[PDB]
Ligand binder design. Structure first.
Ligand SMILES: Nc1ncnc2c1ncn2[C@@H]1O[C@H](COP(=O)(O)OP(=O)(O)O)[C@@H](O)[C@H]1O
Ligand SMILES: Nc1ncnc2c1ncn2[C@@H]1O[C@H](COP(=O)(O)OP(=O)(O)O)[C@@H](O)[C@H]1O
Lengths: 348, 152, 127
């Protein structure tokens, strides 16, 4: 017995932990195993109506099984307690015990990581949009959905020039703390109206699963609104070129939190604020480019490369204020039919 | 049995005490040990959104291990109760038992001190700023961060 | 009981619209759809809409035709619902189009529209 316990490891996941359901879900979908036992798990939702949405799925269940992950032959037991009762889920106390050789101990993290991913793939966030209601932020517009950054198409370098500046600003806590300066940052997306600024900000907030506390342009409560922001938020200031200016700069310098404080700013025409600590990353998202038109055409209609060029040289002529909102409009009205778009969009 | 209990000490940290999670966290990060058993601990935060922040970490777990702190060869057991259930965390009653020679009893405080430091390094305070609102003090400006005296 | 082909021309369009989540998400367009059942009064439009909602076990948030609160009504709809707009030919028009383009939810947003005589709204994304 001592030699056997001397060449193996264990891993107990007990029924209280969140990583218990995740692991059974993972082991259900593993291709190569031999699980003689099975247990039904049935979710069952009754809505406000008598209507029922119900779904059942089988899992390993009590008794030991086997599995082969990467040439390991892991042995798993699942056990129930005959005496103890959990009060969180109203079920007896359960325990999963994984057991492989000591040499492959490093596999366990991998397994759990996989489980976490299969857990995180299903649960999807929703970017709540808060808004100003006097001097207090209220939710508005019951949760939206993530806008999925490939969906917004802007110029060639701007998609990475901001997705890496922000990813750096999320890693410079020590750098901002040791210098004794506040840990905040502003941004200035500027261009013509309808270029996809707000869409990009929402896509970025969905990337970082934060919440957009949108505010469009009162000076005494603006400071109170800046100071009192919820957890995990991204401030957005639409049309900063509509304004009290000294109070704006005062409150903008006086924004604080317990963590990062990103504050994007969008304006239709940007003509003191550009000093670092205030706005420090200005980039110009403008009208459509022959790269943007190609990428939109390939976004709507997967494959079918031949038509793509035949659109671009067509849109090279009769173009004054060609904007990506216009391309989205003239491409959605001719959906699943690029040949109609070839003659429709070219004339507008 | 009496001679053996006559040259050793014990130290029971029971699952109610705050110094239970601290010590397992410390023993996870100790370089030199031999811990055949392991237990997952997964923190899992669901925000106002459906978004999830989750993180798992392995700890010693039930069954006895060994450790060498400063030339001591401390023996540690971790046990679960098959009958009793705690209501504070909803888990069975657990107990860690350290055991070294009597001569190195003075090590225990050192160990616990180290654990406390590894506990106190992560938990960081935030200097709340109260202010006057008529004749009563109200919080203002949701908690700041420490300004780290070398910075000024 | 309605005409020969109309019972399937809508029960399969809707059944397709319940399966195009990825198609509407990847294109970056909102995941909504309108419908315009038109004909003489008393032809069985509302009865068909209620039968369809019973088919999909949703809830009919009926609304018959104020412009400032119409947007608030459009935005705040309960879970598992099917909007119904009776007599869209009775109207503020610009505010109607603005709020109709500004309807959102966390899932499908179907919005049937019934009118007794249908004589800009017919663009996709709208009706
Ligand atoms: N690159 C783009 N990709 C996808 N949709 C876009 C893009 N540019 C504009 N749009 C669409 O244009 C419409 C309005 O643009 P919006 O971003 O609201 O304008 P602005 O940010 O200039 O105020 C939205 O429906 C949005 O999806
Ligand atoms: N095919 C049908 N099946 C069942 N009831 C019908 C049918 N056609 C008409 N009716 C009857 O017509 C009546 C009025 O229908 P309603 O939905 O109010 O008409 P409309 O939508 O034109 O205002 C109802 O009492 C309904 O039962």
């Amino acid at each position: 017995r001592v030699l056997y316990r001397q060449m193996i490891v264990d891993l107990e996941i007990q029924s209280k932990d969140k990583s218990y359901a995740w692991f059974l879900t993972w082991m259900a979908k593993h291709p190569q195993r031999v699980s003689r036992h099975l247990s039904v798990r049935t979710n069952y939702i009754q809505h406000d109506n008598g209507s029922v949405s119900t779904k059942f799925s089988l899992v390993p269940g009590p008794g030991n099984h086997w599995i082969r992950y990467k040439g390991a032959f892991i042995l798993i037991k699942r056990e129930r307690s005959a005496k103890m009762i959990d009060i969180a889920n109203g079920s007896p106390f359960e325990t999963v015990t994984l057991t492989t050789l000591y040499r492959d101990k490093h596999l366990f993290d991998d397994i759990l990581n996989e489980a976490k991913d299969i857990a995180l793939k299903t649960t999807e966030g929703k970017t709540v949009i808060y808004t100003s209601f006097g001097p207090e932020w209220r939710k508005f517009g019951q949760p939206k959905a993530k806008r999925m950054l490939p969906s917004v198409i802007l110029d060639s370098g701007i998609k990475e020039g901001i997705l890496d500046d922000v990813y750096d600003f999320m890693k410079n806590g020590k750098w901002y703390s040791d210098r004794g300066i506040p840990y905040r940052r502003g941004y200035l997306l500027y261009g013509p109206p309808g270029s996809g600024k707000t869409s990009f900000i929402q896509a970025l907030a969905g990337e970082l699963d934060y919440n957009i506390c949108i505010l469009n342009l009162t000076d005494d409560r603006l400071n109170h609104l800046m100071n009192n922001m919820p957890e995990r938020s991204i401030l957005l200031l639409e049309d900063i070129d509509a304004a009290t200016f000294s109070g704006l700069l005062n409150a903008l310098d006086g924004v604080t939190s317990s963590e990062e404080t990103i504050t994007f700013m969008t304006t239709n025409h940007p003509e003191a604020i550009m000093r670092p600590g205030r706005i420090d990353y200005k980039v110009f998202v403008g009208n459509a480019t022959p790269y943007q038109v190609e990428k939109m055409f390939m976004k709507f209609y997967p494959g079918e490369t031949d038509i793509c060029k035949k659109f671009v040289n067509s849109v090279k002529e009769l173009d004054i204020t060609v904007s990506t909102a216009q391309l989205q409009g003239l491409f959605v009205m001719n959906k699943d039919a690029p040949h109609d778009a070839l003659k429709m969009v070219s004339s507008l």
